[PDB]
Amino acid sequence: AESTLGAAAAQSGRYFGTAIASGKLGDSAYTTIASREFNMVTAENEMKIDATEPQRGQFNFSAGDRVYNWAVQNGKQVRGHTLAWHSQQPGWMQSLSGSTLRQAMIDHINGVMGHYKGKIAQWDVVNEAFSDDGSGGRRDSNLQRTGNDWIEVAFRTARAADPAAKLCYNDYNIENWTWAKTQGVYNMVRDFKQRGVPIDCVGFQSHFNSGSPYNSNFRTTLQNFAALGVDVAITELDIQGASSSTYAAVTNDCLAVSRCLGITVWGVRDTDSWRSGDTPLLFNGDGSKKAAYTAVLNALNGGSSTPPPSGGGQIKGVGSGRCLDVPNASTTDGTQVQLYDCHSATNQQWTYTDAGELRVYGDKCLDAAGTGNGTKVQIYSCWGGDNQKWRLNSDGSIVGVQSGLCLDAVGGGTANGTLIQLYSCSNGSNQRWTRT
Amino acid sequence: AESTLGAAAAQSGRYFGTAIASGKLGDSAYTTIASREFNMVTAENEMKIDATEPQRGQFNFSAGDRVYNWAVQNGKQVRGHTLAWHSQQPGWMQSLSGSTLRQAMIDHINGVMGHYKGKIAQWDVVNEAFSDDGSGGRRDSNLQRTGNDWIEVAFRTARAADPAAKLCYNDYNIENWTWAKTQGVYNMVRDFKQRGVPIDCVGFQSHFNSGSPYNSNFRTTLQNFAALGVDVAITELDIQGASSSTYAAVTNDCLAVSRCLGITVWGVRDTDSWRSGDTPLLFNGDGSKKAAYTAVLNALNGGSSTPPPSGGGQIKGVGSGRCLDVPNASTTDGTQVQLYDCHSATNQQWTYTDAGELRVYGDKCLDAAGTGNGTKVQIYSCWGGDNQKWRLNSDGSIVGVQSGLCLDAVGGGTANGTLIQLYSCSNGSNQRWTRT
Ligand SMILES: OC[C@H]1O[C@@H](O)[C@H](O)[C@@H](O)[C@@H]1O
Ligand SMILES: OC[C@H]1O[C@@H](O)[C@H](O)[C@@H](O)[C@@H]1O
Numbered sequence: 001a002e003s004t005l006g007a008a009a010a011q012s013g014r015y016f017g018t019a020i021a022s023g024k025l026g027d028s029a030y031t032t033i034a035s036r037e038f039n040m041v042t043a044e045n046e047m048k049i050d051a052t053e054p055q056r057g058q059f060n061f062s063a064g065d066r067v068y069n070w071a072v073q074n075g076k077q078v079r080g081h082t083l084a085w086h087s088q089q090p091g092w093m094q095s096l097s098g099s100t101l102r103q104a105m106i107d108h109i110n111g112v113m114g115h116y117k118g119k120i121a122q123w124d125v126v127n128e129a130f131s132d133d134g135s136g137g138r139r140d141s142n143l144q145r146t147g148n149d150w151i152e153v154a155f156r157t158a159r160a161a162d163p164a165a166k167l168c169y170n171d172y173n174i175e176n177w178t179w180a181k182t183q184g185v186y187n188m189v190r191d192f193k194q195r196g197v198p199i200d201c202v203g204f205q206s207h208f209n210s211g212s213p214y215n216s217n218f219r220t221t222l223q224n225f226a227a228l229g230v231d232v233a234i235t236e237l238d239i240q241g242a243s244s245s246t247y248a249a250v251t252n253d254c255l256a257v258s259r260c261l262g263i264t265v266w267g268v269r270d271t272d273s274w275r276s277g278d279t280p281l282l283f284n285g286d287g288s289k290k291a292a293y294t295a296v297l298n299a300l301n302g303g304s305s306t307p308p309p310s311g312g313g314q315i316k317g318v319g320s321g322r323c324l325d326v327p328n329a330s331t332t333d334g335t336q337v338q339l340y341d342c343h344s345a346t347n348q349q350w351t352y353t354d355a356g357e358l359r360v361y362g363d364k365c366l367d368a369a370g371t372g373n374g375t376k377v378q379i380y381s382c383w384g385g386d387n388q389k390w391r392l393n394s395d396g397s398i399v400g401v402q403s404g405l406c407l408d409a410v411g412g413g414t415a416n417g418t419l420i421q422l423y424s425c426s427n428g429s430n431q432r433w434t435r436t
Numbered sequence: 437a438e439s440t441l442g443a444a445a446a447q448s449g450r451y452f453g454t455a456i457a458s459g460k461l462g463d464s465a466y467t468t469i470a471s472r473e474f475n476m477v478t479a480e481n482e483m484k485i486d487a488t489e490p491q492r493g494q495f496n497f498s499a500g501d502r503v504y505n506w507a508v509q510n511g512k513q514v515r516g517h518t519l520a521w522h523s524q525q526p527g528w529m530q531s532l533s534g535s536t537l538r539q540a541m542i543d544h545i546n547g548v549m550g551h552y553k554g555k556i557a558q559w560d561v562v563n564e565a566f567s568d569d570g571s572g573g574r575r576d577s578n579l580q581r582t583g584n585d586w587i588e589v590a591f592r593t594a595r596a597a598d599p600a601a602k603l604c605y606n607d608y609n610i611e612n613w614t615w616a617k618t619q620g621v622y623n624m625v626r627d628f629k630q631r632g633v634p635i636d637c638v639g640f641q642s643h644f645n646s647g648s649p650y651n652s653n654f655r656t657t658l659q660n661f662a663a664l665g666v667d668v669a670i671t672e673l674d675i676q677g678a679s680s681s682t683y684a685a686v687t688n689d690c691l692a693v694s695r696c697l698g699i700t701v702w703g704v705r706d707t708d709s710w711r712s713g714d715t716p717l718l719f720n721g722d723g724s725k726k727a728a729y730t731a732v733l734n735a736l737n738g739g740s741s742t743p744p745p746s747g748g749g750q751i752k753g754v755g756s757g758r759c760l761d762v763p764n765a766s767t768t769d770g771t772q773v774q775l776y777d778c779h780s781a782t783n784q785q786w787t788y789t790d791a792g793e794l795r796v797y798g799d800k801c802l803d804a805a806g807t808g809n810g811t812k813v814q815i816y817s818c819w820g821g822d823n824q825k826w827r828l829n830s831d832g833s834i835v836g837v838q839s840g841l842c843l844d845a846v847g848g849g850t851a852n853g854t855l856i857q858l859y860s861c862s863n864g865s866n867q868r869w870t871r872t
């Protein structure tokens with residue numbers, strides 16, 4: 001069922017999940033997308049420490065169970081997040097230190113895992129235990145001050161609480177191999193394995209942005225941890241800008257590492273993101289698929305069996321043999337595009353950007369002046385509107401992000417001068433394109 | 437002066453105004469920008485028919501006077517918007533017809549203009565009286581059904597009501613000279629001038645978007661009406677996507693016409709816009725100046741001593757004599773830019789886009805990883821964030837939109853390999869750039 005992220009991921013034995021927020025489950029648009037696209041669920045906040053143990057010794061699973069029930073009800077496995085962490089600790093825990101904190105950490109793990117015993121596929125036992133100062137050492141928190149062995153203790157406690165769950169160490173900024181933090185985490189997991197400390201996986205949050213950009217060496221990082229005898233998972237994926245290339249690259253990295261169990265993006269729609277300003281997810285506020293959604297789906301499905309048009313190129317219609325053409329090489333905003341004999345001309349060289357735009361002349365964009373059938377497809381100053389974003393379907397169709405409509409050669413026309421419009425996708429030859 | 441739009445416009449005897457919303461006058465972030473940048477004000481809603489005459493014969497000028505007083509007290513003239521219009525009429529007027537409506541229209545004009553007699557620079561006496569059906573004729577409204585001469589009567593009444601006020605006919609989609617609507621309005625004004633009908637100006641709302649895009653012939657339209665002996669004014673300008681080039685083009689069109697009194701943009705910040713989703717104004721919601729802002733200011737100040745960049749070229753540091761270079765022509769996100777001997781290489785060719793990006797390799801963007809002094813300037817996948825948008829000042833500095841900080845050669849370095857960072861603008865030579 002290569003039409004959804006989860007089903008496509010399953011074609012390689014992997015899963016594709018998202019972070020679910022219980023307060024959004026009543027939003028039909030939200031749940032429709034969530035239930036359809038993912039087969040793995042992580043509670044975005046409902047299973048955290050402050051949410052599960054409001055007061056010392058007083059557990060509360062109402063919020064967590066809403067997420068859990070929704071997941072199982074809709075056929076999804078669940079990643080528990082998270083048992084031990086320095087952040088978002090309830091007030092009573094923040095006031096703790098030393099052995100009292102250590103026992104509280106232990107009691108919390110037992111309580112929460114006990115409640116979900118045998119129902120959780122993966123547990124992020126310890127979250128973000130390493131520093132960002134740049135040296136790759138432990139993060140100084142009340143937990144770390146109880147003793148360096150707190151992490152090991154948390155894992156030994158978790159294994160005993162629920163031996164059916166895969167135990168993961170989860171963290172961010174550990175994707176680039178050259179980072180000290182990545183290496184500090186590697187050394188710890190290696191040590192655990194060497195000493196029989198029970199740890200089954202390492203979760204790479206994968207929160208990519210210009211401050212901590214994705215880097216191709218991520219594949220070696222995954223390979224390096226996998227070699228230690230642990231599974232690896234991309235746990236909180238989101239990319240600032242939602243670059244199609246970066247999203248596909250990360251997906252391909254996981255598909256290249258047999259031990260990479262799957263990918264979870266941190267949210268459903270950009271508006272649901274903890275960093276919405278970065279529009280880093282696969283669906284926009286409207287609930288529509290972004291250019292990145294298609295890049296990911298295509299990567300999961302193996303991608304095109306030929307070299308993608310790097311540095312721009314022509315877009316030739318299959319049912320007409322003619323290329324996408326801007327009339328008379330005009331640069332006037334509002335000029336509807338047409339079909340025309342292909343040739344070496346700037347007014348026929350289109351470049352698909354990572355943001356999903358189809359640019360010509362360098363700063364002009366394939367633009368749709370509306371969202372319904374017949375809408376004129378023209379060129380307009382590039383600005384990033386969804387009516388300027390396109391998805392390149394593997395079936396050769398090019399769909400408008402905002403409209404969900406396909407580029408369509410009017411009346412099935414095939415001769416030069418044939419104009420281009422938007423139209424309900426029909427899988428027709430006049431809606432199919434082969435690039436060059 | 438020339439550091440603000442209003443002052444810059446004043447140098448040529450023109451004005452740069454905005455639409456003021458009375459509800460936001462209590463917002464210091466709003467007023468700080470408004471009082472500083474504009475010298476002309478149009479009440480966004482407080483002077484309309486329904487807002488000034490809630491019931492026939494009962495006038496209410498409280499809200500209108502609030503905006504008017506704020507304008508005058510802060511050094512701004514005022515454009516009255518609007519006296520006769522088919523839209524937003526109070527309920528009672530919407531039910532009138534024939535002679536009774538005609539009389540109500542006249543009484544309204546007399547009541548409002550009498551109240552502001554001698555205090556309004558320009559009055560939009562009649563608003564949007566032409567159809568968008570492509571016929572170039574009058575739109576069918578209760579006002580039109582009272583007789584084709586209603587517009588003429590509205591103007592004659594106005595002149596008598598307040599002879600010191602410049603009387604304008606205001607409409608939208610009358611910018612592209614080839615459009616039938618434009619011709620329709622042109623013929624009318626021409627007729628009025630030949631018959632002595634008291635009309636002094638024509639206001640072009642100038643709402644541009646991919647549906648009704650800006651066209652260079654807008655200057656022809658402006659020149660054509662000016663030739664009729666009437667002044668012209670851009671009254672409600674906003675450009676979908678806030679293209680720098682288009683904003684500058686519209687500005688130059690007005691400067692090219694001796695009769696163009698000035699330019700008013702329909703709002704202060706994008707978040708105050710009736711079309712916020714199109715981010716069509718000059719200021720971001722956070723109050724920061726956008727790429728277009730500087731493009732408009734530069735145009736008002738006479739542009740540059742030399743022809744602007746036609747997309748694609750080097751950026752040479754003034755103090756170093758070296759160019760902005762991406763090390764080893766790397767395309768890796770996170771790569772910090774440096775200074776390096778200038779030469780013909782794609783890793784030194786930057787294209788400034790209308791959106792304010794500085795692109796290299798076609799799809800990589802000059803990126804600021806943060807907003808504080810010392811922030812690293814690098815290349816990152818283009819996505820449109822404000823940390824990827826820049827303003828090209830006429831003084832040679834390049835300012836980050838989001839940060840408000842200048843491109844800066846670290847330590848005033850001049851040698852190859854000197855890194856680029858963000859830093860408080862100092863007018864230093866290591867912060868000024870030019871063309872090779
Ligand atoms: O002038 C006829 C046609 O000639 C072709 O070379 C151009 O690419 C088309 O845009 C143009 O319409
Ligand atoms: O006839 C309405 C539309 O039907 C679609 O199937 C065709 O692909 C379009 O070109 C046509 O305009």
Ligand SMILES: OC[C@H]1O[C@@H](O)[C@H](O)[C@@H](O)[C@@H]1O
Nearest residue numbers: 761762763764765776781783
């Ligand atoms: O190899 C040293 C330098 O050579 C120049 O040609 C490149 O443009 C620089 O980016 C590079 O750092």
Ligand SMILES: OC[C@H]1O[C@@H](O)[C@H](O)[C@@H](O)[C@@H]1O
Nearest residue numbers: 844845846847848859862864
């Ligand atoms: O004081 C440190 C900073 O001073 C500024 O004046 C310089 O332009 C910067 O390059 C420098 O890093």
